[PDB]
Amino acid sequence: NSNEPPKIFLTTNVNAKKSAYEFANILIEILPNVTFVKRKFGYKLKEISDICIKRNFTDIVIINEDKKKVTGLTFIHEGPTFYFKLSSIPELILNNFQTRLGQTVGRLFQSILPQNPDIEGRQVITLHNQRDYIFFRRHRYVFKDNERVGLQELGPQFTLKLKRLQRGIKEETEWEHKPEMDKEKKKFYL
């Protein structure tokens, strides 16, 4: 954190047909120092963790694919691991994260995306939080002389939803989203 540049390691599913590699190639812009093995084969995740640590990977991103659309993103930093799932140097915004659980993911995307945060953004990556849904998209940032800033929507676009947050690599689950947990309606978390 604000010490060494995040040196990340992107990954993918095991087989991981086209669409995965596509969305990977849409990630490479918003992050950097981003490599990915581009091929993963059967190993046991302990190995990948170790070999990453020796290579000074702070954190790893795991894409998950249903062979058709990308689904879910695991973020592993030695530390917690998140499982999101999603449905479709710059600046950055966050919104409505105010909570412990919220400020956790806040600390995430404030660590990951900015790339030891940089500046001069005329294009901004906006993470907004509405109820139980993390969204972000990327605008381009144009002042209109009076007050309001006109924007272009330059893409891409998609929502996340947090599902897992668990302490170690795999270790214990410190939060869930049950199917029932929305039986109750107004909750809103983060």
Binding site: I93, H128, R131, Y133
Partner: protein, 169 residues
């Protein structure tokens, strides 16, 4: 006598028989070799029969004869079989002696298969801790989509952006 019990099984129905879409019709009995109820594999009309079957242990060769035919609660005899594929096969064609060729030829096979099955299941026990299957009920879907749509709709999403930019100014 048995040929009648067959023909009854070949016109009326067995409790168990399948009739796959092509012309041929399985036999789902727990005890049989080959799993096709035809004259020579259907355990119900033989009166002399032998198969191989897993206990959750190793693979007991089950045998029957005419004499316990009337005493079902105990009819099938049973034998265990070694962990030496070689020695196994020798045990199998041992006990079966003048049992006709059918049951040596086939019983041996069922052994081979179940052994392989074991070995696979042993591999797969050790593999791919990752990405379990999961179902999603339909109303789970409907609920997620709508609630999301409303989520976005609620956030006009630029007012946040700009107001944050006036903030930064």
């Amino acid at each position: 006598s048995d040929e009648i019990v067959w023909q009854v099984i070949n016109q009326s129905f067995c409790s168990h028989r399948i009739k796959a879409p092509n012309g041929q019709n399985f036999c789902r009995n727990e005890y049989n070799v080959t799993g096709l109820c035809t004259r020579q594999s259907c355990p119900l009309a033989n009166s002399k029969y032998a198969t191989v079957k897993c206990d959750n242990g190793k693979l007991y060769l089950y045998m029957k004869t005419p004499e316990r035919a009337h005493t079902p609660a105990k009819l099938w005899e049973r034998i265990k079989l070694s962990k030496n594929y070689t020695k196994a096969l020798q045990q199998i064609d041992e006990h079966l002696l003048h049992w006709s060729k059918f049951f040596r030829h086939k019983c041996k096979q069922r052994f081979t298969k179940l052994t392989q099955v074991m070995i696979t299941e042993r591999r797969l026990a050790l593999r791919e801790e990752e990405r379990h299957y999961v179902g999603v009920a339909p109303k789970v879907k409907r609920r997620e989509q709508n609630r999301e749509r409303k989520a976005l709709v609620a956030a006009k999403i630029e007012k946040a952006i700009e107001k944050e930019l006036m903030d930064r100014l």
